Amino acid sequence: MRIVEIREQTAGIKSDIANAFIDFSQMTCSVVAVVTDVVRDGKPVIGYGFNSNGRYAAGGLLRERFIPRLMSAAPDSLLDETGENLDPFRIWTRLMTNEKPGGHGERSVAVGTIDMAVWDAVAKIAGVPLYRLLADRFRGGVADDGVWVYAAGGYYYPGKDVKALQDEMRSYRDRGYRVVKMKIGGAPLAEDLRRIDAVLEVVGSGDNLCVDANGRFDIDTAIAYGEALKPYGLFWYEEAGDPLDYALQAELAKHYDRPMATGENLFSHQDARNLIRHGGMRPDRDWLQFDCALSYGLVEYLRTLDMLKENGWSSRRVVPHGGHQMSLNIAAGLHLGGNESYPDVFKPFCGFADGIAVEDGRVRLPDLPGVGFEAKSELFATMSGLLGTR
Template sequence: MPAAQVLTNQSSKIARAEVRLIDIPLESARGGSGATQLQVAIVTVTDKDGASGTGYTYTLGPGMAAIVALLEELHLPAIVGMETDQWDQEWYRMRDITHRLGDSVPLLATSAVDIAIWDLRAMRQGMPLYRLLGSQREQVPVYGSGRATHTMTTAQLIEGAVSYVEEGFSAVKLRIGARRPEEDLSRVAAVRKAVGDDAGIMIDANERLDLPTAQWFAPRLVELGVRWFEEPLKSRHLDAYRVLNAGVTPPLAIGEHILGLSAFSNYAGVASVWMPDVPLTGGVSEFRRIDALAEAHGMVVTPHFLPELHVHMVAAGRATTWLEHFPLLDELLSETLEIKEGWATPPDRPGHGLRWDQEKIERFTVRCEKFGS
């Protein structure tokens, strides 16, 4: 929004809301999950002055129809006619209403609306989102995560890691758990040799290991100078994480499968790296609370995926450290985040600054519902 169009009133009444269900077949398997399908719900909220904000949530595979159904039944009818400064109270009301449904579907639905409202708030102020949230830094370090999969050969893993280092990234992430432990360890060692001792290496097991295998890996990863050991076990196995953390291990990292503040609180003192995903864990509002909790306990936060949105969270957070480079939404964006020498700067435009490719959104939309006038 140009400076001349800045709307100085912080609050505004929401006049219209829309949700689109988008289903995209991915050309190749992504990351450690091997996902070949991406479903996205994009929520747009428009106020009485015509200012708009967008938010979203996603699933790697099917299931988004359930989130969209809840948005249509509960969230979007509730916010039409609402003043945006009432959302902070409404967020908790939505949680209380859906309490018996658990955290997954309700929090994903709430996340999409929450992001859209924060985007609208920043748009009205003519400010980038990270500045509205309270900027702590102007640039954030980025680690390379999008060039390593289980299906790659060791030579391909090395090529991807080396390319990141040559582009100025100071750390890369590799994935283990889909092959024999000895083979995975050999692949990590080969990458370490190729990138040298100065480059950071993070290891993500995508919850594929059992406790004995994780205990076998952990001290060997320490010997290879691994910076953190991400999701070695199922996130629901909290006691197993406590056992693993009591032994010799790199710092443990958790978060992409943990939803909401209370779930993260269980890991204080168990996993020192927290990786919340804003479109899944409750939106910008809940991320801020998770960041505050992490700061209080001396943990660090590095969001999962989605650099175009999460660059604002890392720039505004107190406990935040790294931004993850992983291309997930590229098929729906007309512009991706620019990274120079391993550093990223939040876009200097109002709101979160995501620029959606409207032609592709229309092409992959399978459902669209509108509320309000």
């Protein structure tokens, strides 16, 4: 058996939604197919992957460096010790051959996208959902019954006012989510507080509301927002300052004693480790948001999780950015704290399996092989169409 070919294509997820840092008018993502010669249920096993919103597609990197490099390897060199499934670890090593250290951006997305497809294929060859594969290999067969999820939206948009924002959040609550997340930092403080007030009329307690500044604030603005946010008792205050300005987050923690979250824009275990060492994150109350699809994949994510354990952090503090089924499987299989979900934005690259409802903030995973792409009609149609695998 072998990987026969790897295909890539670029998809559009463009719209005029905006956070404090960017708008999404040009936003794209990569989709990948890892085609094998293994037969399951009368058809070839093909693994699929895509990268999360916000970083754009990485098709250039995929086609110029990573796909050729992986496809020039001897095919047996990519197999596990049984000879009857792929080895994501050998594949990762091949992908990263002749890559210099540092510079963890863009190529991190290319590798993350291939890694997703590789794990999808491995689980399909094994005949199990990915969470089951991961629980069996890494957690002694113990998987979570379900995963904590929150609904992320609350973007700025032309003409969107507090009534529309309330309607949005009510629609998330009606779909089973308890906790929601909104953007802040893209309007004057008083206007953001009025937006927060409006959402709380819908969701009740601050316990049910997260806010995300998308890394836009300098220290003075981060502290000023913090002081204004304190009375609301929000579930978390996310990415106040630049994702790499570790000293800024450490100073902010001296002034804001309620939970904070960051890390979606750190794309390696090295960068994650620097956050842990230098960022003043607090293991009993803060949250880490690393996204494997943007960060060289699950093979790299396991190094990050090992580093967290060695530095006194629980995996239960990790709630990945990105809203994807790959993270959902990792959460239940490796015991993360939960997963972000997008009920509205970035269609069709959002949501989990069709027909499996979120119930008071928790969702179960389908007993279907792989990551679960085939259980999302619209997304699967879009991906197989783009990649020519119908």
